[PDB]
Amino acid sequence: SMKKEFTELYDFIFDPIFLVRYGYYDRSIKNKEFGKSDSFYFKVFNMESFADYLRSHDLKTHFNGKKPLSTDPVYFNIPKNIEARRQYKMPNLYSYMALNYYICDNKKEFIEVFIDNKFSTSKFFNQLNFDYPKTQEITQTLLYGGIKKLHLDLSNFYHTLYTHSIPWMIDGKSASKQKGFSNTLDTLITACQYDETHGIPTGNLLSRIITELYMCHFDKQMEYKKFVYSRYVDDFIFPFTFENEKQEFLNEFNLICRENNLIINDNKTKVDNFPFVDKSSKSDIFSFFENITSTNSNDKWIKEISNFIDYCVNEEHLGNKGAIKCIFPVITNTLKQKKVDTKNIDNIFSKRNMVTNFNVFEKILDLSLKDSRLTNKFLTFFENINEFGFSSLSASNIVKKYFSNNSKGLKEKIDHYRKNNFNQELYQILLYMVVFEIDDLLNQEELLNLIDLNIDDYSLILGTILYLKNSSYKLEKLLKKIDQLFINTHANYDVKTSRMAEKLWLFRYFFYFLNCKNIFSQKEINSYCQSQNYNSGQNGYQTELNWNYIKGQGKDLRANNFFNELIVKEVWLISCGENEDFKYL
Amino acid sequence: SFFENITSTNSNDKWIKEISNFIDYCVNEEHLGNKGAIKCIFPVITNTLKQKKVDTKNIDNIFSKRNMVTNFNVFEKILDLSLKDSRLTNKFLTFFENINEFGFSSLSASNIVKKYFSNNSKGLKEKIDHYRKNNFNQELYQILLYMVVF
Amino acid sequence: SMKKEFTELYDFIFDPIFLVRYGYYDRSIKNKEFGKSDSFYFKVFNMESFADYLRSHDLKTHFNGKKPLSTDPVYFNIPKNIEARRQYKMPNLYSYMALNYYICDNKKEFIEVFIDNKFSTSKFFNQLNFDYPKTQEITQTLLYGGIKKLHLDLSNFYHTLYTHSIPWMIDGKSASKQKGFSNTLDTLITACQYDETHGIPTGNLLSRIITELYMCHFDKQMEYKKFVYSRYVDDFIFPFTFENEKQEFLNEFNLICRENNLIINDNKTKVDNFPFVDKSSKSDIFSFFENITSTNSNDKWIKEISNFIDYCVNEEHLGNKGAIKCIFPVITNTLKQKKVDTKNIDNIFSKRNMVTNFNVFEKILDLSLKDSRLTNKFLTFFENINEFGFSSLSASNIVKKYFSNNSKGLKEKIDHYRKNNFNQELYQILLYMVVFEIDDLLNQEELLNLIDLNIDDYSLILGTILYLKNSSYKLEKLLKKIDQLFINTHANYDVKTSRMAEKLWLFRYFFYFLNCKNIFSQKEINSYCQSQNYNSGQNGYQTELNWNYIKGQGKDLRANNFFNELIVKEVWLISCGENEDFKYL
Amino acid sequence: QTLLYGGIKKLHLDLSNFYHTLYTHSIPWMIDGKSASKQKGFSNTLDTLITACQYDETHGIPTGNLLSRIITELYMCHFDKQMEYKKFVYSRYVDDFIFPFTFENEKQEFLNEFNLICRENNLIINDNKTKVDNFPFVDKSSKSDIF
């Protein structure tokens, strides 16, 4: 039945190993590409090694402590639109696992609410089968009987939520002015973001699960008042016929929002009158390549792909949300279904027109660079067409030519992104440079300029990879820069604070893991420490660069012990390539 | 030309999805100024099912299938569309007669309409009260006609 | 000089007795009516008695405790516009005095920042001489040299400010991840609002002073980047000539906002191009009555006043902000300057036209009822024209006739306001009923319906006054209702919580003060307690209605002792009229 | 002004071509009730005289004199009688209505009853002049500067 299928879904979801293998980076599992929320390159940043370690070792012995350790997340900033920004907070892995274990032991408090709920089309999290059109069917069924539709949307819901209002929603505000499940969940949520009570750390499955529980108690209240609507996260569609219905709904909705410190985005409040508008229809996009077959010339294929990209950008401009994100999946599916030869795939995507100087892969790459949220979409598309026959060397040469041709614009874009803390836009350029072996856009002293403050952890890792890939460069101008960065970061905390509970936890772990595997040769680190006259000790040189000294510094060493167990057992959080040489093609 | 690239060998789920998308497409077309685009929904669904040579068992499966997880039935969507504009009463009822001859059993359609009316009983009762107070003759006529027929 | 005059202003302002006599209710002192922020009727709600008590007694002996007691403020909701709402939080008097004393002892940390500041036109707080046109002159001087003006506005600045970000602004975010002035000020601010770290308690001078200090450190950062602009609270005007100037300013402004968790209201972001638009010009309003003299007939005066009200409402509609609030002051000033006889004042404002059934005072009253933020404006205007000659009995009869004529609409408005927690709209109607002796709009069981939950403290006090004014009614249907309300309110707190640190502190104090002065006869309270079978004790009947029993209940009695000292010394926070009979005309 | 008291919102309604398209036989329907008209009296004789003034044409009222305005005012005063029996308050000048209200349910109830009366009496609403004024109210027609 409905309840059995929901119970199977939530039994599969509410598993700690699942919530770290796919939960941390907000991936989707299809069996035991629209709603896909994947925002980090799986080939570099994944939790496969950590989840493999978890399957055979229980780490709950590290979270027996009463008070949750307060840690600092990775601050990653992504574009909301062409002008606005959205702030992601990637929690410390220790804090993430604490919250993960707590939610998985208290799964009963989430599942029953999710089961009883009727209004949410987002309580399935784009998992195994409950992909987008099924939630669309649920919305359709919920919208029956209404000649009018009222659209409501909370403004900055994730980023401005008062974290202490979670017990107010779950248990009642009054019962909260007086230990329990909601209070402990609140403490763990704030511990994931350094005791900050402003917002929820966004960008993973646990945050979405907690937000869905919060909004499902919202729905519980609003259905107790005998209302019916469809909600996706914080977007409400309320079907109604009579204006008194809308006014009563708005009154109760406003009371609940005001009581819970929620702000309504009044710019998105609209009423649709029947006949209803439906801008986001994908039928034309999916049927764009119906009248093209594998017997057509490769030039026809190139022209149709270019026209298709232009068509989808126009569709996105015309209000068809998500139409650009459908470009890559349906190009891949068309090439796979139409049975196009591998030599033909290579010819289509590698052909450079002698007179127009036009290459279709370069057009797709430029499209990806126009919106940084298309980074993983582009890279997945490239992996697919690489398996189809498009050689990796030709793609690398095309991307090299693009970067060389647009070097001035790319350098000033990097300067802008680094000045303005545009984290994902910088991450995309450095990720393309790492993946496609771009070894001339930035020289040595520009690469060293990215290892500084206000640079996100993933960008720092990608810059370090770019520095290590170039064997000409000397890793002492790098060790000095990294050590200075580590010292400056620790200078912002109390001296009795463990380093892995601070900012740059992921970049620190990257560096110490690389040091243990001896990509940073111990001889040259020793020479650098001697140059800086670092006092030796029982277990090293007492520098920020020495994990043996760092792992025992601080009054509270729970995160240090956690990450020491990961390092000792050779668990990597950043993939160094299939041959440990930082090559990803 | 909405159903050009669909054939009788396609799965019934594909047929249901295409009919739902087609209804949404026609409502959008009517909204965009294409006068009479909703009134073309029923005739071309009927003509498509007749031309594509879809089996009677398949007709019954398409229009009677109730999705276990989304709780979605396409006949219920068409019925709701008909109830949104009372001028579509005879269009809906003619369409139902056609698909009844095609294989969609009358008992299943009656059960679907029963479920819709039971689910939306509150809204329908207040609509009847509004229509009876305001002398909205055809809107009341449509609801009572559906009650009599089904 | 400039600095000496600013120093005199801030020496006068930063005085605890000043910050309670005018600070608490956000009043303005002219010598030792535009920007006036007065939102509560001075004749009922004032701190004259408390400030008089302070001048002769030092209450700092009550705030020697280390940990600030966390108290619950009075939640008062006022309209932001015809559709939106603004939330006021009137702090507990104990918490208010704690924060007041701390700010006055740390005045040096505010004054130097205010002195050095250049960009703020709001760091004067509409005090002695620094009224609106002088801040306009400051803005004009700051806007020199710019052919273009960029307007920026933070969205929901007071109500969504993260209170822990105050140390980030004042001391630097980095120096805050490590006792000081900023941390203690943060603790006191959160204690004023029951440890809630979401927003600043709005509606008093201390909150405006702290907000100005926060924004003056904002200005300090932005001027260190060599920018020039004019800011009023959170409204920025940035003069510029070249687009690179605007882009650089927007970049740095966005960085500071993002770092400090501040949200920009993108709907109010506009660029004015020269020639500049100036909608808010008051010259026509002030010159409306130039060609009218005291020798004109009273009918001419009535017609001109009516036309003037219509003109000002139109001006407000056309974007002339604050044009309606100028109606009452300039009518009063015109009648005073034109030397109109007192008999003529009475004739103008009391004449009821026999055929049109039109009275100008009724029109002004209806205008006041259209926007509840005009309550105090209307009541001040009525006091002025009452001194000018307009008899109080005639005004009471006119308001009686209006309320009787519109009784149905007013009753359904009261029901709407009470259901939707529209605090100021209800407060205005009950205040008009109390002031003008309206004794028939609500009967006994409707009056008792307002003494319930989700009703603000001032509305509860006004309803109690309306009940006591009617000598026919029995105060046992009132004592039962109040006791039930007190029990229900205390049921939402831990049993070891002192009652004066809870919600409804002001209404509780009102009731106990009234009981000590014997407006509630002790005999009838005793009879009610016996009817409810309340167990007696060493010091009373152990009911919520007995201050002798309540004052010693709770683990922490600092607020109880404070308010006990106020009650014992017969300090009133609600004025009972000049003759202690609740009559205010 | 006195009639518009108590309303934070104003709804403006206007009948379209009221004088020129009025069905003259609907005057007894308004004055006496439509039902009592499917069965000599004052209203019938007034209707006959009105049509005689315009050559037995039953389409409109002869416009441009005081008698036509008096009859139109009587017609609309029976309209007002019905609408006040339903406990409504508004200001009407000829066929221009200003309805003061605060809550949207008030406006919807008023529009429902107003539409029923118009439909029953063959009256057409000028939907191009239907507007809602929100406070602060607009006042374009002010003659102070001219005078």
Author numbering:
A (entry chain A), C (entry chain E): 0 to 31, 43 to 188, 192 to 598
B (entry chain F): 300 to 449
D (entry chain B): 150 to 188, 192 to 299
Paper text:
Abortive infection (Abi) is a bacterial antiphage defense strategy involving suicide of the infected cell. Some Abi pathways involve polymerases that are related to reverse transcriptases. They are unique in the way they combine the ability to synthesize DNA in a template-independent manner with protein priming. Here, we report crystal and cryo-electron microscopy structures of two Abi polymerases: AbiK and Abi-P2. Both proteins adopt a bilobal structure with an RT-like domain that comprises palm and fingers subdomains and a unique helical domain.
To test this assumption, we have prepared a Ll-AbiK variant in which Tyr44 is substituted with phenylalanine. This protein was unable to catalyze protein-primed DNA synthesis (see below), so we assumed that its structure would reveal the conformational state before nucleic acid polymerization starts. The structure of Ll-AbiK Y44F was determined at 2.7 Å resolution by cryo-EM and it is essentially identical to that of the wild-type enzyme except for a fragment of the 21–57 loop. Residues 32–42 could not be traced in the Ll-AbiK Y44F structure implying a higher mobility and/or conformational heterogeneity of this region. The fragment spanning residues 43–49, which in the wild-type Ll-AbiK–DNA adduct structure runs parallel to the nucleic acid chain, adopts a different trajectory and runs toward the DNA-binding cleft. As a result the location of the C-α of Tyr/Phe44 changes by 15 Å positioning this residue in the vicinity of the polymerase active site. This conformation very likely resembles the state in which the protein attaches the first nucleotide to the side chain of Tyr44. Nevertheless, the structure of Y44F variant reveals that a conformational change of the loop harboring the key tyrosine, which can position it for the protein priming at the active site, can be readily accommodated in the overall hexameric architecture of the enzyme. As expected, replacement of the protein-priming tyrosine with phenylalanine (Y44F) inactivated the enzyme, confirming the essential role of the hydroxyl group of Tyr44 in DNA synthesis. Similarly, cryo-EM analysis of the other inactive mutant, Y44F, showed that the majority of the particles were monomers and only a fraction of them, which was used for structure determination, corresponded to hexamers.
